Design a protein around this ligand. Structure first.
Ligand SMILES: N[C@H]1CCC2(CC1)[C@H]1C[C@@H]3C[C@@H](C[C@H]2C3)C1
Lengths: 34, 33, 34, 35
């Protein structure tokens, strides 16, 4: 239970979540003008 | 730790999906150049 | 844990922060000109 | 100080930072000649 390890884990989870949300928005936007 | 394993697998899938996304968008925005 | 894990944790936190600033900049540019 | 999964994820995180840095660098560059 290193603080850096736990923070890095949570940040990786949040990073992938926000990435799929951002790219979902952008892929839905680009899925209309093509 | 289960948290470390979850974060590791999420990081690997994140890199893989980001690479596929980058290939998609680089081959989609490589026609303009 | 080991230097590899510590550096990887610092780097993952940096990566989240950097991608946050990148997407915030792009969303602020696409939230005023669209 | 050795989990194979942890070492793999660490190397992957470093390479991910490097690749995203290069991606956004050349992206910002392309978006620097167009603005
Ligand atoms: N992309 C980051 C890189 C650092 C780790 C994943 C998230 C990796 C696996 C676990 C254990 C350490 C710290 C994080 C969680 C090394």
């Amino acid at each position: 239970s290193d603080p850096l390890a736990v923070a890095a884990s949570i940040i990786g989870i949040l990073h992938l979540i926000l990435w799929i949300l951002d790219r979902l928005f952008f892929k839905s936007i680009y899925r209309f003008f093509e």
